[PDB]
Amino acid sequence: GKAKGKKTQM
Amino acid sequence: SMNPPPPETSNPNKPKRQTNQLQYLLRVVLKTLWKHQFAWPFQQPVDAVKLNLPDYYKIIKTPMDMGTIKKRLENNYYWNAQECIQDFNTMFTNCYIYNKPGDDIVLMAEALEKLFLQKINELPT
């Protein structure tokens, strides 16, 4: 299924 | 809502019974994980409608999250500590079977799981 959004800051 | 109902969190007729292990799970394990900087994706059920994830609940048979676990501990829903430990294990498994390896969320889950397991290795008798 579809990926989740962005969650951390790199 | 087209999301599933959230897992049950109270048992109306169940007696209130603490154990050393359940006290540890609430006051040490859940306390530490809830405040970790990576906790937030895990603090509530996955809102598949909002996230537009139409296949999440096809892939995940047994939804679980730390908000549910917190309420269950607060409401003394668990009869024993092993039930709670299983819910944490399910939560992590769900993340690892749905999300691509190396996605941000997976690295976040891995950090939380490591902390979880380190605390469980110090579980009271």
Author numbering:
A (entry chain C): 1198 to 1207
B (entry chain A): 42 to 166
Text of the article:
Bromo and extra-terminal (BET) proteins provide a recruitment platform initiated by the recognition of acetylated lysines (Kac) by their tandem bromodomains (BRD, Dhalluin et al., 1999, Jacobson et al., 2000, Owen et al., 2000). Direct targeting of BET-BRDs by small-molecule inhibitors such as the high-affinity and pan-BET specificity thienodiazepine (+)-JQ1 (hereafter referred to as JQ1) enables their displacement from Kac.
Our structural analysis identified multiple cases of non-histone proteins binding to BRD4 BRDs through histone-like motifs in the same structural template we initially described for H4. Our data therefore suggest that Kac-XX-Kac motifs beyond those found in histones can be recognized by BET BRDs.
